[PDB]
Structures are given as C-alpha cells and as structure tokens.
Amino acid sequence: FVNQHLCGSHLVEALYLVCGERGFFYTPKA
Amino acid sequence: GIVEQCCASVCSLYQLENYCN
C-alpha cells in the first residue's frame, strides 16, 4: 500500500497504518 | 515535504516513517 502515489486522505491513511500507536504528523505545506 | 515525495512522486516506507512521532 505504501509504494504508490498517495494523496490527501489516501496519504493520511497510509501514515495512520504505518505509524500505529506512535501517531504521525501530516504537514502538507512544510 | 511529504506531498512532493509521496503524492507528486511515488512514496516509500522509508519516507513515511520519517513522519511518525
């Protein structure tokens, strides 16, 4: 699921699945 | 940043994990 173009909700879903209980930061302008 | 690396171009686990806390 990760080795593709991931945009928008699809990118946040991949971060969610990969990062698990760590959580993540989603910074689309930085 | 993430959009350039994973949306405009093909993402990687290696790069996603850099955004994990």
Instruction: Please state, in angstroms and rounded to a whole number, the distance separating the CA atoms of residues A21 and A10.
Output: 19
Instruction: Please state, in angstroms and rounded to a whole number, the distance separating the CA atoms of residues B7 and A4.
Output: 8
- The nearest alpha carbon in chain A to B12 belongs to A3
Tell me the two tokens of residue B10. 């093909």
Q: Which residues of B touch A4 (CB under 8 A)?
A: 10-11
Interface touch B16/A2, C-beta < 8 Å: yes
Phi-psi label, residue A20: left if phi above 0, alpha if psi -120 to 50, beta otherwise: left
Q: What residues are paired with A24 via a beta bridge?
A: B20
- The separation between CA B13 and the C-alpha centre of its own chain, rounded to angstroms, equals 7
Distance, in angstroms, between B14 CA and closest chain A CA?
A: 10
Q: Which residues of B touch A8 (CB under 8 A)?
A: 7
Please say whether the beta carbons of A5 and B16 come within 8 A: no
Say what the resolution is, in angstroms: 1.2
